[PDB]
Structure formats: C-alpha cells, structure tokens
Design a binder for this molecule. Structure first.
Ligand SMILES: *[C@@H]1O[C@H](CO)[C@@H](O[C@@H]2O[C@H](CO)[C@@H](O[C@@H]3O[C@H](CO[C@H]4O[C@H](CO)[C@@H](O)[C@H](O[C@H]5O[C@H](CO)[C@@H](O)[C@H](O)[C@@H]5O[C@H]5O[C@H](CO)[C@@H](O)[C@H](O)[C@@H]5O)[C@@H]4O)[C@@H](O)[C@H](O[C@H]4O[C@H](CO)[C@@H](O)[C@H](O)[C@@H]4O[C@H]4O[C@H](CO)[C@@H](O)[C@H](O)[C@@H]4O)[C@@H]3O)[C@H](O)[C@H]2NC(C)=O)[C@H](O)[C@H]1NC(C)=O
Ligand SMILES: CC(C)c1cc(CNc2ncc(C(=O)N3CCC34CN(S(C)(=O)=O)C4)cn2)cc(OC(F)(F)F)c1
Ligand SMILES: [Ca+2]
Ligand SMILES: [Ca+2]
Ligand SMILES: [Cl-]
Ligand SMILES: [K+]
Ligand code: NA
Ligand SMILES: [Zn+2]
Length: 802
C-alpha cells in the first residue's frame, strides 16, 4: 500500500528513501509504483527542452522549465548544461585542449574528489575504435585519461551479474546474482530481470560500493535509475546533487544508459542503426562534462566510463533445440539462450538422472554448438559453481548461438545477444578513467572487472570489503592513492631432508632396473643439496600459506615441495632452455619407480595401490622426457615425483610434457614451469583440507587431484633467455581437469595434436586462480615491484585474436 496523497515539493530525487505507506520522491519511486501524485509535475519537468538558446539568456527564472538560463542558475546548480556556452561565450569541454590534471582542482569545502561512474549497457570494446568518428567526447576522455584496450566481464556476460560485480568486487557465485534469471531452492523463489522479486534484498550478497561508502562516512548518490527518467534528467540531477552543501553532498554517483544494448539486440553489434545510439551516448557524456565545467568541477571529479558486457551477432536460426537430443524433454526446466542451465521439472520425479541427460547431450551432432558440463567441470577461470542458484547441469554455448528446449519456445526479431563465455572477444567491454586520481594519456593492459571495486575504494579513501580483486594489481592506473600491500607471511616452513632411509626399508611393490667414481659422486651430492636450484627455481620457492608438513627436495633438473600429508608434491619447479633436447624413456626404466631415500616409506606412495586400482594409473610432475642427461633421468622416476592420473588424462599430460613444453621453450626463449596437483572437491575455488577429499587411490591414503596446474613463465623481452631476464615477465597458466574420460573433447579419438591444445586453451588460468586453489604464493623473489607482480598474477592468456 502507497498513500500517494503526500507531496514531492522540495524532495525531488531525495537521497534517503522513505518508508511505506508514505509516498516516495527518490529515483526508484516509479519502479515500486509509489511516487507522490505530483512527482511528474515537480521532478520530471520538460518544458522548453534541455538547451539554452540565445533568447533565453538572462531570462527571468520560471520554475516550470526543465533547466534554466537565468543569471542565478549557477549558484542554484540547475542551469542547462550548455548555458555558459550559449550565454557567456565559453567553449564546449570537448573543444578544449587536454591538459594534465596533476592535482584535484576542487571548490573549497570538497574533502575528496568526487567519483562519477558512467555505466553503459552493452558497450562492446571495439566501439571505441570503430565508433570513434561519432563519439568525440568519449574519445577525448579515452585519449586524455587512462584507458584499457578492453575490460573482461564476468560469466555469465549478462547485465546484473556484471553491474553487481562492478559494485562488489565479487564473482557472481559469491555475490549471488548468477544470471539475468534464477531459482533459489532454499527460498523457493524466482528472480527475474523484470518484475518485483529482484528488489528483495536477500538476493544481493556481499557489500556494494554505496554501502561501503555509507558505513565509512562517505555519502552516496543513488545508483539506480527508473527507465522512464530521461538521460538528460539523470545528468541534471547528478549536477544538482554536486551543488549541495558540503554536509549533504554525496561523494559517489552512478549514471546508467540502457544503450547501446537496447539497440544492439534489435540490430546486431554493428548494424547501421547503431551509429545513432553511439552518437546519443556521446552527447550525454558531453552534457556531463560541460555541466561539470560550468560548476568548476571538470578538473576535480574522477569519471569512470565502463560497460557491463559487449554484444555478439545472434539470430533465431542459430538455435540448437534440446528436443533434438532428449526424448524426455518435458521432464526438465531449461534456463535458455546464450547459456543453458538444466534442472528437473519436478523434484518428485525419482526417474530424472543427470548422468543420462549429460550423456544424451554429449558430442551427438558433428557441429554441435553447445557443450554440456556438470558445473564442477566447467573451466575454473569462470568461477561459476559454488552457489545453490547455479544448476548442476550447465551448457556452454558457442558464440553466435542460442540453446532452447523446443522449437515452439523460439517462434525472427533479434540480431544481437550476449551471455557467452567471458573470454570471447565480442563480450569484452570498456574502461576509461579520467580525473586527478587517474594517470594522464596512459594505456594500461586489459584487466578484469572484479578489480575495479578495490580501485573505486582507493579513489574514495575507503577500505574495501573482502572481495575477489587482487588489491594493488591496478596501482598502475593511478597517479596517487595507490594501495601498497605486503606479501603474505609464510605459515609453514619446509624441512630439508637428507639421506635417512635404506632401500630395503621400502616395501612398495615398486620395481626398477637401476643397479648400475669420485668426480661425479661429489657432483651428484651437490645436486641433491641444491646446487642447480638457481636455474630451476627462478623466482624463489613458493610460500605455503597454511599449516602443513612438507619437504624441499632438490635434484639436477627440478626442485619440489613434497607434502607428507598428501604424499606428493604441492609444486615442482623446472627450467627448460631454448636449446634443451627431448629424449625418450629408456626400455629399462618403463615401469620403473624408485624409492626416495630422503622420505620415509610411511610418507611415500606405493606401486601396489596403482596395480590394484584398475581405473587409476600414474604420471610424473617433472617429465622424464626432458632430463638433462641419462644419469639425471633416474631422478624423474622417484616415487616422490609420481602423481595419480587416469589413463585418459595421461594422454593429455603426456602430450603437454613431451611436445608442448619444448614448443614453448622454442617460442619463448626458454620457460620456467611449476606444476602440481589441485584438490577442489567442493568446487569453491579454494584449496581443500585433507578431510574434504572424496577419492583415494584404491586401498591407500593417496588422494586423487581434481585438477593439475602448470605456470609457464619467461621473459617479456624474448631476446633474453628465461633464466637471464632483466625486466618484466610473461606468463601463461592452465588448470586442467583431472577426468577419467575425454568426453569433453569431441575429437579425442584422433591424435593428441588435433585436440589437446584446444582443451588446454579452454582451461587457461590466472596464477591467482592457482594460488586460491593451492594456498601457495608464487613469485616471492624477483627484482620486480610487488604491484607489477600482482598484475602478472592476474593475467589471463585468452588465446583470442586481437
Ligand atoms: C571471493 O571473495 C569472497 C569474499 O572474500 C570469498 O567468499 C568468502 O569465502 C569465505 C570462505 O569460504 C566465507 O567464509 C565463511 O563465512 C561464513 C559466514 O558467512 C556469512 O557472513 C558473511 C559476512 O557478512 C557473508 O559474507 C556471507 O554471505 C554469503 O551467504 C549469503 C547467504 O547467507 C549470500 O547472500 C552471499 O551471497 C554469500 O554467499 C556466498 O558465500 C557462502 C559461504 O559463506 C556460499 O555458501 C554461497 O554459495 C555463496 O558463494 C554469510 O552471510 C562462516 O559461517 C564460515 O565459517 C564456517 O567454516 C569455518 C572454516 O574456517 C569454521 O571454522 C566455522 O566454524 C564455520 O563452520 C561451521 O559451519 C559449516 C558450514 O555451515 C559447518 O559445515 C561446520 O560443521 C561448522 O559448524 C566461513 O568463515 C565468506 O562467507 C565468503 N563471503 C562471501 C561474500 O561470499 C570467496 O572465497 C572468494 N572466492 C575465491 C575463489 O577466492
Ligand atoms: C557500475 C556499478 C557500480 C553499478 C551501476 C548501476 C547503474 N544503475 C542502474 N540503474 C538501473 C539499471 C536497470 O534498470 N537495469 C539493468 C537491467 C535493468 C533492469 N531492467 S528493467 C528496468 O527493465 O527492469 C533494466 C541498471 N543500472 C547499478 C548498479 O547496481 C546494480 F548492480 F545492482 F545494478 C551498479
Ligand atoms: Ca547489459
Ligand atoms: Ca575447495
Ligand atoms: Cl541467465
Ligand atoms: K592401475
Ligand atoms: Na572424446
Ligand atoms: Zn542485453
């Protein structure tokens, strides 16, 4: 109930929301159907339009007008944004030369530069270049401020998940807004893009920027705008707020445009009808900047120009239909479109079996334009699993396509859509930062939108709530207010075991044909005490950030941190130069596993368990194929370098180790590799404790990894070899799912050179993803600044063209 007979006079776009049934005058009142009767009359004025003309200059204030051209408008803060241009001979902001903003130039009484977040829906990254001739205000922002070639959204590349990620610094699985529609089975309720349930506060987790600000004494304008409030009125309202007295004036604001998304859906990302929406957004930016300039705030305010996601070409005819695959199609509910989520239509159907569904959807047509996944098997880079609102069965849809349940659901209207995998080029969006706190004419590398919350906090002097950004990885965007973190302290120090066990103490069912001089006797002791470690451990040993028991093991070709709890390495580190040679496994060592006399039988794997486990085999973290010499090759067969691997995954691993590592050393002028296992049985993106492990090698305490990682590092200047690099580093990484079949790869019956690399690209990862999953902290000893290292740890190699 709304008692809509109260008044909005003197309350237009009130910041504090007032409780029902009292009628509201805030920028959302229309969305709750709850505005006072006189709201449109008093707060949505339109008379005489949005521009001064020559004849209105110096007019008598008439309060019916949309904006004013009278002499008192600047003091009042309600001039049309072109007032000084038309009436005082001033120039438009876009026609002024760019001049470096070295310090905030703010009116007296401003305690910090304000921040305005100018958010644009569906603004694809390539619009900055392709639409540059029709967007001169945006282009001036871009070239005079700090910009990135693109900004990576979160998955799914939908509106609310991205806007709310921007607000919180959280992945959708953590903030809770996991799609543009959702079913929460605990609440037994549904969330939709349209409608009222989305306003319930229980959907929205974490702490958004406006709350972070309020709790720390920084006032915020309201970020949300009802669709009917015209853009010009949004701008004028922000300008009015900025004219408030010091004690009432907010320090943070958001503008939102529904364009160019709204047109992009109808015409495609580059349809000829797209030029006008881009022109109109540019005009709006112009209105803000002229507006700020009249108030003497154009060298005071930090402005962020940012999109939620891009836009792809998608039409009705590129729809896949589950009714072409499933005979049971009416026993499921599909969340459809550019992704798919499946659950049982009824939870009382005991016949519904997800395994049969997955199987019926797997590699059934030769060009199938979606791939089914259990959500825990999705690429870890998507961070799209640890929420009850994400259905167990997921469909990753190819770019340019839709999935639907039946043809009747689709009957064409639209030519554009978004929602796909967040590494897809067409889904990329924009970032520009302009103002005293940003750098001047600076280009920064692409970065993820999860990082911006921290930076917005830095811009405002706020302490960010716990989030998924890596605070300091974006310090290179900022002139000042940088955040200078310290490296996490190591929690467990390693043991450095010497030779402590006799060969006959081991009864492991392991066999090796190895019963085979003082020059090379002292030479091999030094290799075991760590004499080559500077070659293979380039950036220091990783730090263990949790309580555990482990050992450092040195060898000629590799160093490892061996866990006595998980009975295998947490990490193995080695360097392969450009000139290194690949050799084969000699016949005398094919099923060789040798006890490691530094490590007790009781903290060692055993071969018998693998013999008994008919499903599980084993591989090696340091590849025997890349041993430096025949004598060094025996080290690769130590039981302490062994890890459990399904024979299907061994095809992947073997191709990586035997072919790809050498290929990368050739291309990159050497590589350093760190590899190891990951255990994430509860799909939370975080390292499992021992008691979370759901699968062991039969009859043993040897835990089975869910994934295997590798971090491949070299010199960014590839004319310098990886091991003698003076400057910045280059990295690519992977987190490969450790699966007993290759059902994920439809071409896996062919040679590994036709399908393994494609799998690995799909499972590309950031170093920081691996850190969360392992509790390790890498790159502890470089000669680089820590912030530069944090940037490197957040890099994702996407394998998309420019
Ligand atoms: C990305 O960054 C984020 C933010 O840092 C990381 O997420 C954090 O991860 C922490 C580690 O998992 C997690 O810590 C837990 O918090 C529990 C209290 O949580 C409530 O309070 C906080 C603070 O206000 C709030 O943030 C939480 O909000 C979540 O839940 C609400 C719904 O209630 C959602 O609206 C919101 O979206 C959010 O959901 C997300 O997180 C939850 C988990 O908290 C997921 O289940 C959701 O799917 C979704 O992802 C909460 O309102 C606290 O109770 C936990 O403590 C248990 O475990 C510890 C182990 O140390 C144990 O010692 C404790 O005693 C306790 O155990 C008991 O409970 C167990 C579980 O019921 C039980 O099994 C045992 O037997 C014990 O009796 C724990 O400290 C923190 O909440 C979230 N925060 C957020 C915002 O998500 C995230 O990890 C990062 N991601 C990556 C990849 O790095
Ligand atoms: C960049 C960050 C800081 C941010 C900006 C804004 C900006 N303001 C805003 N205002 C209204 C809408 C809106 O209405 N949008 C989107 C789809 C729909 C909903 N429908 S509709 C009106 O048809 O129901 C269009 C969207 N953005 C909001 C925001 O909060 C949030 F994440 F929760 F969104 C965060
Ligand atoms: Ca959008
Ligand atoms: Ca986990
Ligand atoms: Cl969705
Ligand atoms: K076996
Ligand atoms: Na296959
Ligand atoms: Zn859209």
């Amino acid at each position: 109930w709304t008692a809509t007979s109260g008044s909005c006079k003197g309350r237009c776009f009130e910041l504090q929301e007032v409780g029902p049934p009292d009628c509201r005058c805030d920028n959302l009142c229309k969305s709750y159907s709850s505005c006072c009767h006189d709201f449109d009359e008093l707060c949505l004025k339109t008379a005489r339009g949005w521009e001064c003309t020559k004849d209105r200059c110096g007019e008598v204030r008439n309060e019916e007008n949309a904006c004013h051209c009278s002499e008192d408008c600047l003091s009042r803060g309600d001039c049309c944004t072109n007032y000084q241009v038309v009436c005082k001979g001033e120039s438009h902001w876009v026609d002024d030369d760019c001049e470096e903003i070295k310090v905030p130039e703010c009116p007296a009484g401003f305690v910090r530069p304000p921040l305005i977040i100018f958010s644009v829906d569906g603004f694809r990254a390539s619009y900055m270049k392709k639409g540059s001739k029709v967007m001169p205000n945006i282009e001036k922002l871009r070239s005079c401020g700090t910009h990135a070639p693109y900004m990576r959204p979160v998955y799914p590349t939908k509106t609310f998940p991205n806007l709310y990620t921007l607000a919180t610094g959280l992945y959708p699985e953590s903030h809770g807004i996991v799609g543009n529609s959702m079913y929460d089975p605990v609440f037994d309720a549904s969330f939709h893009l349209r409608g009222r349930e989305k306003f319930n506060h229980r959907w929205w987790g974490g702490q958004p920027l406006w709350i972070t600000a309020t709790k720390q004494g920084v006032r915020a304008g309201t970020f949300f705008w009802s669709v009917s409030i015209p853009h010009e009125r949004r701008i004028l309202t922000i300008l009015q707020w900025l004219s408030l007295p010091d004690n009432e004036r907010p320090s943070v604001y958001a503008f939102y445009s529904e364009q160019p998304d709204f047109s992009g859906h109808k015409y495609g990302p580059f349809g000829p009808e797209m030029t006008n929406p881009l022109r109109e957004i540019d005009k709006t930016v112009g209105q803000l900047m002229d507006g700020l300039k009249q108030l003497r705030l154009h060298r005071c305010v930090n402005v962020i120009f940012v999109g939620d996601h891009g836009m792809e070409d998608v039409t009705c005819d590129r729809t896949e239909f589950l009714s072409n695959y499933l005979t049971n199609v009416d026993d499921i509910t599909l969340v459809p479109g550019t992704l798919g989520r499946i659950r049982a239509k009824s939870i009382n159907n005991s016949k519904y079996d997800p395994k049969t569904i997955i199987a019926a959807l797997t590699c059934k047509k030769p060009d199938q334009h979606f791939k089914p996944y259990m959500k825990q098997h999705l690429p870890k880079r998507l961070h799209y699993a640890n929420n009850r609102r994400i259905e167990d069965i997921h469909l990753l849809v190819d770019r340019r396509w839709h999935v639907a349940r039946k043809p009747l659901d689709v009957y064409c209207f639209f030519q554009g859509d978004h929602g796909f995998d967040n590494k897809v080029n067409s889904m990329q969006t924009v970032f520009v930062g302009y103002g005293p706190t940003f750098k001047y004419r600076t280009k920064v590398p692409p970065f993820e939108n999860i990082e911006l919350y921290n930076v917005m906090c830095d811009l405002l002097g706020l302490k960010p709530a716990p989030n998924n950004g890596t605070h300091g990885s974006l310090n290179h965007l900022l002139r000042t207010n940088t955040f200078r973190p310290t490296m996490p302290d190591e929690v467990s120090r390693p043991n450095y075991p010497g030779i402590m066990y006799l060969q006959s103490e081991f009864d492991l069912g392991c066999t090796c044909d190895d019963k085979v001089n003082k020059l090379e006797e002292l030479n091999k002791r030094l290799h075991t005490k760590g004499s080559t470690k500077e070659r293979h451990l380039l950036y220091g040993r990783p730090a263990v950030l949790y309580r555990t028991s482990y050992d450092i093991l040195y060898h000629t070709d590799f160093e490892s941190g061996y866990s006595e709890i998980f009975l295998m390495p947490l990490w193995t580190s080695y360097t392969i130069s450009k000139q290194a040679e690949v050799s084969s496994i000699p016949e005398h060592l094919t099923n060789c596993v040798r006890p490691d006399v530094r490590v007790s039988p009781g903290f060692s794997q055993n071969c018998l368990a693998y013999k008994n486990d008919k499903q599980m085999s084993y591989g090696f973290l340091f590849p025997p194929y890349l041993s430096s010499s025949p004598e060094a090759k025996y080290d690769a067969f130590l039981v302490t370098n062994m890890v459990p691997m399904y024979p299907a995954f061994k095809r992947v691993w073997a191709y990586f180790q035997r072919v790809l590592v050498k290929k990368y050393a050739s291309e990159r002028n050497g590589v350093n590799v760190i590899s190891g296992p990951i255990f994430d049985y509860n799909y939370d993106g975080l390292r499992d404790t021992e008691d979370e492990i759901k699968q062991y090698v039969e009859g043993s305490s040897i835990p089975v990894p869910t994934h295997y990682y590798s971090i491949i590092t070299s010199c960014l200047d590839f004319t310098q070899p990886a091991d003698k690099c003076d400057g910045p580093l280059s990295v690519s990484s992977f987190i490969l799912p450790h699966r007993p079949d290759n059902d994920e790869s439809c071409n896996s019956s062919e040679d590994e050179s036709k399908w393994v690399e494609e799998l690995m690209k799909m499972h590309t990862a950031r170093v920081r993803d691996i850190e969360h999953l392992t509790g390790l902290d890498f790159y502890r000893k470089t000669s680089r600044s820590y912030s530069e290292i944090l940037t490197l740890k957040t890099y994702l190699h996407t394998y998309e063209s420019e």
